Every structure is written in structure tokens, then in C-alpha cells.
Amino acid sequence: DHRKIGRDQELYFFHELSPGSCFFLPKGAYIYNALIEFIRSEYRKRGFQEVVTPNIFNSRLWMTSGHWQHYSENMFSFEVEKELFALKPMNCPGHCLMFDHRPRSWRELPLRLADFGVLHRNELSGALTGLTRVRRFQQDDAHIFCAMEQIEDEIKGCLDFLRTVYSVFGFSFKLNLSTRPEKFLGDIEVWDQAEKQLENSLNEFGEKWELNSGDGAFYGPKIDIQIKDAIGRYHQCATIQLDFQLPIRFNLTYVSHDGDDKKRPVIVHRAILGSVERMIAILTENYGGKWPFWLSPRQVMVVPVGPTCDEYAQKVRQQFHDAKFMADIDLDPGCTLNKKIRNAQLAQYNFILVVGEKEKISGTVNIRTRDNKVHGERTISETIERLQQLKEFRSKQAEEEF
Amino acid sequence: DHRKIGRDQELYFFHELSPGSCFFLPKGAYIYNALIEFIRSEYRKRGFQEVVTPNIFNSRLWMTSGHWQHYSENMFSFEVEKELFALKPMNCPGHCLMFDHRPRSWRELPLRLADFGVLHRNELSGALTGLTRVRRFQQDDAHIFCAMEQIEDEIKGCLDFLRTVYSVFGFSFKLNLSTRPEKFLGDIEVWDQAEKQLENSLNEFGEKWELNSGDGAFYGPKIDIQIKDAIGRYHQCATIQLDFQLPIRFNLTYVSHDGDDKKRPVIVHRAILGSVERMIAILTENYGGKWPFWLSPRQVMVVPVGPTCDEYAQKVRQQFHDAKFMADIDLDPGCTLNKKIRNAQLAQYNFILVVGEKEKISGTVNIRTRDNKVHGERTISETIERLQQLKEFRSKQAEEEF
Ligand SMILES: C[C@@H]1C[C@H](C)C[C@H](C)[C@@H](O)CC(=O)O[C@H]([C@@H]2CCC[C@H]2C(=O)O)C/C=C/C=C(\C#N)[C@H](O)[C@@H](C)C1
Ligand SMILES: C[C@@H]1C[C@H](C)C[C@H](C)[C@@H](O)CC(=O)O[C@H]([C@@H]2CCC[C@H]2C(=O)O)C/C=C/C=C(\C#N)[C@H](O)[C@@H](C)C1
Ligand SMILES: [Zn+2]
Ligand SMILES: [Zn+2]
């Protein structure tokens, strides 16, 4: 489904020379960068600070993190000057080094570090499918370093995030709490404070949530989120994961209000999209090829009524292109208006701007949609402004709200 | 000094667990993304199309491109499922695969594909210095696929690209043509057409250039370009490099206007900044920590006169942060106005917004620069507007031009 649309819409493809990795053609790449810019746009508002980290590390780091022990087979390892190195499966330890880079206080907390960095995980070749099961991807990854007392407040924020992002997509979602398992690490009082705060947040949030007892990780309790597509399928995407182990293994510390300087923070792993790749696949199948305007690789199709208008159509497009819209043009003299409009619709262009003598004289465009409805003849400036609003607010039906 | 400035400004650091790879703190990360965004802003105007490509490839690909026989000592390679894979030192072969993905025509040319993808090259620990000699970097990398006859024009565009970017940085620059070496591959006629067109555009560019004979690569002629910093030191960053070998090795063809489907295009490797890392090192060295407002990780410092205004100050600081600016705040009740201002000026904040009771009721701010010049009182909206104009135009002196 999403793969066939990927090839048909010239979004992305796969080659046997890099299994589990994807090739994004300029349009799919536009979608990639669009999603990332969305996440960042929310980061700037929510107090998340993006960082750039290394993609490879010495084996010792993975030894202290616990990957070399429990993840070793999923990691690509190689040798640099007789020392063991590996590509990062996760961004977490690198962020731990960043927190531990200098002394930190309680006034810095909560400290939220976001990373889009490239993750590699070694998946058996037989199990690889499309963008769903991959060896390479960029996850929208942030870690929250806070005090225990702050947890409840950070979680509710973390939920407010989800509900916002998904509400842009038009997804409905369900939540579930996985608590302390049989075998667990660290003191149980910490576990209890944490889980109490988690429950309080989930209840304050208002959504019906499920409790899976003992299904949490040994290093911390967790909230999992599943997304429901248009057809009603569920995909595990978002997660909120507490880690008490990581601060101990990297010996992480802040200076309390008190301030005792031996207090360790709590780590919160969170992702919302999952990975960009995964979100792209799911969205490609969910939208059925019809992309919302802000995500759309083909936003505008300028078509002339006749060759006489070929120049005007060139101007118009350029102007829309200078408005940061993805705007193409159909100049083929050997094809009819209706056929160009229809083909633009089959190619899933959100807006088709038809121009003719009347439009050339008045400096206007005749607005057609993908649906294909008529929005009449408007000035190019009016149209640009309206489209700009539809793009900025990420309207899911732009054509109807025009 | 760029290391010392990186640490003192809290930009980036290095760790023994990943030598040759850099850790970018939120400020350095801002600089990073700002540079990439600049290059993209110029890509959108010049007809460059960005793509996303895999970071690891099968040994077969590198044996096709020639990296296996040539660059293998600088490549990190590892075994997966009894097959050799490697991290990509360069983006080129993947782009060749993207060109070869479907049949193409003269109408599609020139086809300019840009890639910001992460590149690793294996450098000796002893050779590693800061951001200047690294194992990990993101190149601003583009490949132009054009017909031979188009070369002279494309090169011209390339130069115009070079001229624009550097002029934003305020960099003067040198140009040198390297031509066919004694040991060379490809037909000599092709070489002669290429070098002819290169000479022509270098001459129509109107800037003095040096001729280095036989100093070119075996696979093509090239134009190397060096930038001079404010101190008068030259750095090798930009390159335009022709490749006839890559199209042959990957068997790339397009359909000519005349109907011939057997014609190979010419590949043009181009990079303006070299690597983002490298450009960051050079700019850190060049500016002395005094960043142009658009590149500056510290844009705005909000200082309240007294506790009564601590509220208003945080609203201001918030609004500016929503406006996408980097805006900090100095709340310390134990410190005087003048030393908060002086310290902000020492920390190289471009603009210092002082906020009193008078400003709280008026919905205004009192503007002071890094150079300790007063712009007086302006509304928040006005200030945001002017600052945004100065940011969008990437002005070299924002403080003086406000
Ligand atoms: C090295 C250990 C392997 C662990 C047993 C892997 C499990 C399969 C599972 O626990 C992983 C997990 O849920 O990670 C989830 C991540 C978060 C988002 C998506 C999920 C993701 O990235 O897949 C987060 C956990 C990171 C955890 C650590 C780190 N560093 C732990 O301290 C460390 C003990 C993990
Ligand atoms: C495998 C070959 C290795 C070649 C001999 C390396 C030389 C040391 C040097 O010529 C590399 C070079 O100039 O690359 C320069 C790149 C371009 C900008 C920065 C520079 C950069 O990235 O450093 C570009 C060349 C890419 C070339 C190819 C590819 N693929 C060639 O077809 C292929 C034969 C390269
Ligand atoms: Zn994590
Ligand atoms: Zn190249």
C-alpha cells in the first residue's frame, strides 16, 4: 500500500544495496523535512532544546549504558585502531554524557534535550518490510531530566504534546500504563512515587486509560500510546518511559534546592512520531495518497487555458513558488484543459490554478480543488495569503476550508 | 581558539568515547540548523532538490563507485549476514542510484540533487583536531546531472551561488582551475569541451583566477575556491568538480532531444561550505564569538529593572521566543541592572531589552545593543518585526542597522 503509493507518487524507494534503508526522492524528502519542522515547531513552544550528537561510539559507552549486554546483536559493530566501536541504536547515552558535561543545578530542571539523529538497528533481512521494519531511521527523540517531584508535571505536558500533534493528523489514540514488573531494578519507593505521579497525570488528562500490571520495564514504569488510523487499525507509536537506571550507570547528579549535591535526576525517554519513517508509512496508507496541504509535495498546479497565457502561468507559478509553496505548471500545448485538471487531480495536487485571458488581465486565478470544487476567481495575493494560513495552521481539510 | 570559544560560549564539546565526532549543545545546534537552513533557503531559489539517502551500503556499491579500490582505508566497514557493508564517506553513488531509478530525459536536465546526509570518514586519532579534522560531518552536498552543452551555464550558476553565500558571511575569495592530469580516464574530447566551458564561465564571471595545469582528478577537471577570513587566512571549503567516470560506472543515460537514449550526462560534485562542522569552526574563529544576529545563539537578553517587572519580562521573553528568536532572561534580584547589561554584552547577546514599570504599562521595551548603543523605546510588536527583518535578510550588522 504505502510502498506502491511511494513509487507511484515518486516519494521513496528501496534498493537491494541498502536493505532496511530508504531513498527519499525530493517529494518524500519534502514530507520528511515537513514532519521534522512540525515537531521542531512544537519543541520551540514547549521548552525542548535540540542537540546534535555523534552516530558512533566506543564499546565502553555501550558497556556502561547496558546495550553491549542486552542489545548487542541489534548493533552494527566494527573496529577502529584496535578498539571496538558501534553505530548508535539509541540517542540516550550520548545525551547522558551531555547532561554530565558540566555541573547542573535544580534551576536548570526540567532539562529537555531533543535529537533527530540517525539511528541504526540490525534487523534480520527476512523480516524487513518497507518503512515499517527498518535498519535505519530518525526518531523524534527527547529526554527529560527532572526531579522526582517534577515528574507529574512533565508527564501531563508530555500528554498535551501528543494530543496536539495527533490532533493535527486527525488521529484518535489510546493510552496504557505499564507498572513495576516482578524483576525490577532500584528502590521501590522511587517506583511508587513515580507511578503515583503517572496515575495522577493520566487521570487529570481525562482520557480512559488501561493499567497493565507488572508489564513495565525493569528500569522504569511506562506509558504507551497507540494511534488509530482512518480505517481503524492501531499502531504503537508514542511512548513515555521512565529510567532510574541510566542516571546511576552514568553517575548523573544535580544540586538540589537544599542543596545536597548527590541527588540523581529521573530520565524520561519520549517519542511521538516514533520515527519519521514509520510515521511516513502510516500516513501514506492512512491518507490514501491524499496529503493534507501542509504535508503535500504537490501543493499547486498552474495550468493555462491556451499558449497565449503560457507566460502568465509562468509568472503566477513563480510567485507561488516564491511564497514557499510546492508549485508546478502544465504547459503541454497538445493537451486539453480538462485533461490537465483531471490528471493534476489524479496526481493528488491540492490546488489547481487555471489561468486565461480574463485572469491575465485582472491579475487573478481560477481556483479549482482536488475534489474537484470551484472556489472562483481571486487575486493571486488573496490566494497566496489564504493558502499561507492554511499551511501555517496545518489544516487537514484545506480544500474545504478555503 | 574555536575550541575555547565553543566551550566558553557553551556551543560544542568533545568526548573520548567518540573521537572526531562532535557534541553540539543547544546553542551550537542552533548555529548548525541555521547554516543548513540558509543553504536550503538558497537551494529553493536556485532549483536544487533535497533528498534523503541511506547511511550504509553493500560492498558491491562501493566496488561500483570505486571507493572500495580507492577510499577503503578511510571507510568504516563491518559485516552483516556474511556480507560486507560500509558507512558512506560520500553521498554520490546513492544519488547515482536515484538518477538511475527511472528513465529520464533532456527535459529533466539539469537535475540538481542536494544532500545533507551524515558522512563518516576514518581519520587517524593523531590527525584529529576539533571541528577542522573530523571523522563525522554533514556536507552541504549537491550533484548536478546535466548535458555537456549545459555545463558552462551551470558552472556560472555555481559561481553565482558561491558569490551569494560568501557575501552574506562577508568573505572574499580566490578561484583556481585544475585541468587534466597526466594519468587520466575518459575521452580527451569530452575533457576538452568541459575545460573549454569551464574557462569560458570563469572568464564571464569576471574575477581573477589561477591556472593549475594537470592538477585535476583522474575522473574530471575542477574549480577549487578558497575563502579569506577577517584575519587574512585562507581556507579550502568550496569545490566544483566534474565527473565523467561516475556516469560510466553506474551506466547513467538520458533521452536526448534528438531521440538518442544512449547519451550519458556529466556529474557535477559541488559543495559551498564543505562541512557544516568545518564552516562552524571557521566562523567561530572569524567572528571571535561575536555572531551576526541571524547566526547568533544568543539573540535577546531580557532584563527586568526590579522584581515588580519580573512578570512582564517573562512575557516579553516568551513572545520573542515564540517569534522564533533565541531569547534568554536575567532575573537575579541580587545583581544590578548595569552588570546584567555589561555581562550580557560580554556574553555577546546582540540585543538587550531592559524592562521597567514604564515599559510594563506601555507594552514596550528599552533597546540596548551589544556595542552599548541605545535604540530607545519600542513596542514588542515593532521590535519583533524589525528583528525579524534583520534575521530574514541575514544582515551583517544588525545592531547598527536597527
Ligand atoms: C540498553 C537497554 C536495552 C533495553 C532492554 C531494550 C528493550 C528492548 C527496551 O527496553 C527498549 C526500549 O523500550 O527503549 C525505549 C525507546 C524509547 C522510545 C522508543 C523505544 C525504542 O527506542 O525502541 C526507551 C528506553 C531507553 C532505555 C535505555 C537506554 N539507554 C535503558 O536504560 C537501557 C537499559 C535499555
Ligand atoms: C572513489 C574516488 C575516490 C577519489 C580518488 C578520492 C580523492 C581523494 C578525491 O578526489 C576525492 C574528492 O575529490 O571528492 C570530491 C568531493 C566533492 C566535494 C568535496 C570532496 C570531498 O568530499 O572530499 C568530489 C568527488 C567525488 C568523486 C567520486 C565519487 N564518487 C569519484 O567518481 C570517485 C572516483 C572518487
Ligand atoms: Zn531514549
Ligand atoms: Zn560528490
Author numbering:
A (entry chain B), B (entry chain A): 322 to 723
From the primary publication:
ThrRS is one of the 20 (in general) aminoacyl-tRNA synthetases (AARSs) that are essential enzymes responsible for charging corresponding amino acids to their cognate tRNAs and providing the correct substrates for high-fidelity protein synthesis. We determined the crystal structures of both human and E. coli ThrRS in complex with BN, and identified a unique structural inhibition mechanism of BN against ThrRS. BN occupies a significant fraction of the total volume of the ThrRS enzymatic pocket, physically excluding all three of the physiological substrates of ThrRS, namely L-threonine (L-Thr), ATP and tRNA. Although occupying the canonical active site cavity, BN also extends into a fourth ‘orthogonal’ pocket.
To elucidate the species-independent, full-spectrum inhibitory mechanism of BN, we co-crystallized a fragment of human ThrRS containing the essential catalytic domain and anticodon-binding domain (residues 322–723) with BN and determined the structure to a resolution of 2.6 Å. As a typical class II AARS21, human ThrRS forms a dimer through the catalytic domain, with each subunit binding one molecule of BN. The polyketide BN binds tightly in the aminoacylation active site cavity of human ThrRS, constituted by class II AARS signature motif 2 (residue 432–469), motif 3 (585–613)22 and surrounding hydrophobic loops 386–393, 411–413, 538–540 and 564–567. The plane of the 18-membered ring in BN fits perpendicularly to the seven-stranded β-sheet of the catalytic domain. For instance, Q460 on the floor of motif 2 in human ThrRS forms a key hydrogen bond with the only carboxylic group of BN. Notably, the carboxyl acid group on BN precludes a key interaction in aminoacylation by forming a bifurcated salt-bridge with R442. By interacting with the guanidine group of R442, BN prevents R442 binding to L-Thr and ATP, thereby blocking the formation of the threonyl-adenylate (Thr-AMP). C4–5 of BN further pushes Y392 into the tRNAThr A76 adenosine-binding pocket, whereas in the tRNA-bound structure of the E. coli ThrRS, the corresponding Y313 stacks with the adenine ring of A76 for aminoacylation. In our structures, a major feature of the BN-induced conformational change is a 14° rotation of the α helix comprised by residues 431–448 that produce a 10-Å displacement of the preceding loop. This structural change is observed in both the human and E. coli ThrRS–BN complexes.
